[model samples]
Target: SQAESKEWYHASLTRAQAEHMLMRVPRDGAFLVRKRNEPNSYAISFRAEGKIKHCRVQQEGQTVMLGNSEFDSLVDLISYYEKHPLYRKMKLRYPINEEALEKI
Candidate 1:
């Protein structure tokens, strides 16, 4: 629920824009969610190992799938991964908010 108004999720963010936003943070764990090119698809764009990385999220049927798990919503997925390593032992820590974008 807290991530609801966080503004870190973009409905129509391109890969370039995601990278641009992640670069502004310049820190590991900075993250945002964006709609993927495919219909009803999404991706988690996060900064890790000094570079931006993307992991796809699948909304197959009704549940959202990520890695080896499934979730009810994107917010739920983000919340779960915050405490768990997403991939390559990278976890979602700081969210790239609007304030960070303003500083650019």
Candidate 2:
């Protein structure tokens, strides 16, 4: 740990959850996430299968632009994503059974 980085709300985060939180930034924050194929200014990223899988936190006027979200109760985030089509699309790494589609 850096000496300069003394205690300050450093709650531990699993990489997956942290990455999820970063991408979901905004009542329910929403941040854009993309498949990694090149250099990017991502709030969070990861590598798998011996390669880097990048996810960028985008912004205005360019090839890279992501809006921020993730500043709420995780429960609140879910409600928003469930209600919004784009957010629902983005937050769907966890999918339900095809048979249960109609029920959901």
Candidate 3:
């Protein structure tokens, strides 16, 4: 039925977009609650050597999971992905944006 969504909608960013997304300056982000009582704060998640890593970092100002990180640029990414050539990919999935949840 057209009324029902056959598959869930997910937002994805391009390589440049993803790189730029994190490479840019950090900003204030709303809290993200993964579960009922999980540590709710700014964090970081990324892929390196085909494995994903998560860490809770309390940095000055703001630091969003994907919207923030220590890496500076593509050069930074290449040097920081553990083994030089092992960096596989980077993905950051955020909750539904405010506009998406509002009743249309």
Candidate 4:
């Protein structure tokens, strides 16, 4: 399956919903990717510093750019961020999942 179709990706998730979902975990690094209000753009919602932080990602042509890094796909971008922190040294660790809501 394409990376975009992964459970972590929400097609129409809003900022408020993203925050609500991430807050459910209440742990740093819990994150999800959702469609931005703007057409053809995306954003990341992640927990950091006891608060939720949002990062914008733009898909230009065949690549995606976050910060100064360019990734071939969203999957690669996520994989890289796991090893490298995004903002304020906050790295993506746990991905929010609906099926595992009980476990969390």
Clash count per candidate: 0, 17, 0, 0
Which candidate order results from sorting by lDDT in descending order? Answer: 4, 1, 2, 3
lDDT of 3 at 87: 18
The parts of candidate 1 lying over 4 Å away from their true place are 1-6, 99-104
Better of 2 and 3 by TM-score: 3
Q: Put down candidate 1 lDDT per residue, 1-104, tens digits, no spaces.
A: 34346577876678887888788787899999887889868888998899888889988766789877999878888988899998689889987754324344
Between candidates 1 and 4, name the one with more favorable TM-score: 4
Q: For residues 1-104, what per-residue lDDT tens digits would candidate 2 score against the true structure? A: 12112221112333454445444332123222222333433332332232223344432223334356542332333345446543323432232111101244
- Residues 47-98, candidate 3, lDDT per residue (tens digit)? 3333333345332333223235454432233234333322133323222121
Clashing residue pairs in candidate 3 (N, C-alpha, C atoms within 3 angstroms): none
Model 1 lDDT, full chain set: 0.80
Model 4 per-residue lDDT tens digits across residues 8-66: 78876788878878878978999988879796589988999999989898887788898
Where is the poorest 10-residue window by lDDT in model 1?
95-104
Best by lDDT: 4
lDDT for 77 in candidate 1 is 87
**Once superposed on the true structure, which residue ranges of model 4 sit more than 4 Å away at CA?**
99-104
